[PDB]
């Protein structure tokens, strides 16, 4: 069987960055030439692997993470970076072995009045560990008085919505990002090239 990269890259709607989706890739044959031979990607950066040699390699574990972020935050999807996305939404490891793929989605994820369905975690007390997902909706305590589910001063909802409109600049325009994680261990392979 062919690996289900179409169901990840060509999904009608992507997940929010705070609740980034992970699709496990196993027991299939992956033709990565469908990705690196395309001109529809604005970002295609592979760490520890060469994009042209992917079809000549076998992997024990492969994961595909997908989410939507702003154009100015694609840089944060990289090892050693800092920011709202890297610290509180999606953290890449320092020893990352994989590829980060992004493409502009203004014609799909931006609405005339503003698409407010895509969310990012704004308030958090600690930085995320690598490959960690936090989907909590608990009210964030900015002071010393507990919130107890009531929003107000020093008591804020942790998730804020992106304002995606077609008039937004490239930095504020939505970008769909797919992160591929490759694990090469001393174990039988599960994903191989044709």
């Amino acid at each position, epitope marked *: 069987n062919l690996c289900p990269f179409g169901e990840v890259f060509n999904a009608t709607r992507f997940a929010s960055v705070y609740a980034w989706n992970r699709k496990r890739i196993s027991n299939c044959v992956a033709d990565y030439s469908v990705l690196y031979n395309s001109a529809s990607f604005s970002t295609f950066k592979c760490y520890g692997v060469s994009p042209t040699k992917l079809n000549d390699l076998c992997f024990t574990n492969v994961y595909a993470d997908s989410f939507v972020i702003r154009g100015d935050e694609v840089r944060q999807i990289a090892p050693g970076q800092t920011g709202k996305i890297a610290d509180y939404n999606y953290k890449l490891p320092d020893d990352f072995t994989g590829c980060v793929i992004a493409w502009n989605s203004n014609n799909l994820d931006s609405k005339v009045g503003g698409n407010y369905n895509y969310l990012y975690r*704004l308030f958090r*007390k600690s930085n995320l560990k690598p490959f960690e997902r936090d989907i909590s909706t608990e009210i964030y305590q*900015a002071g010393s008085t507990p919130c107890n589910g009531v929003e107000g001063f020093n008591c804020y909802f942790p998730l804020q919505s992106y304002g995606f409109q077609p008039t*937004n600049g490239v930095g*504020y325009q939505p970008y769909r990002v797919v992160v591929l994680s490759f694990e090469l261990l001393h174990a039988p392979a599960t994903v191989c090239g044709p």
Partner: antibody
Amino acid sequence: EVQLVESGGGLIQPGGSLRLSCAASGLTVSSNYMSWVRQAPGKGLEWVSVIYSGGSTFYADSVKGRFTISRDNSKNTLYLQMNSLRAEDTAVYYCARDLDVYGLDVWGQGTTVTVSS
Amino acid sequence: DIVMTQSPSFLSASVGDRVTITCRASQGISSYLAWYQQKPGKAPKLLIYAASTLQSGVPSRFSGSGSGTEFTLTISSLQPEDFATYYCQQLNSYPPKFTFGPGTKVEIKR
């Protein structure tokens, strides 16, 4: 009540060093976005630096490497170490609590730093 | 970098006028915009966030409109304490975290 009290500013020669302190009450510095904003004489406002609740620090390009933002939870005070001071850095420095899309709601009275050009 | 501009620079008005100050963005920034008020010798005070929402404790005469490249701060009836310098602030920007506009000063008509 809620209040930010700033201190630590004066006159200093180019290449000098000074530390600003923004003591806070009514909010926890370690749990908030805390930003420094400066206003040059007769000019507008400009962002200087910000520290996240998670410890990440970001600086303006004109002050990266020279200015260092820090905090002490035991004293609930936000700090701004300013080294290698130049004539561009003379301004009234404001400490403020940042709420991102909700804006800068709490401000300090301000501290004047006049580098002795 | 996204450039924030404000028009006008000096505005003359009497008490009770409807005053509209415009802030312009070089690129679309949706609702990432905030309005502030500064008086001489006083630290800036937040008035509006998200370009339309009014901060608690701000009088209802202050209103904000616009999304994208053009934004306006509207005062329905100018009060004697409203004579100050007003700044717009782009939010969640890059490379700087936020960028302030040039500012607009409101003074007494005579």
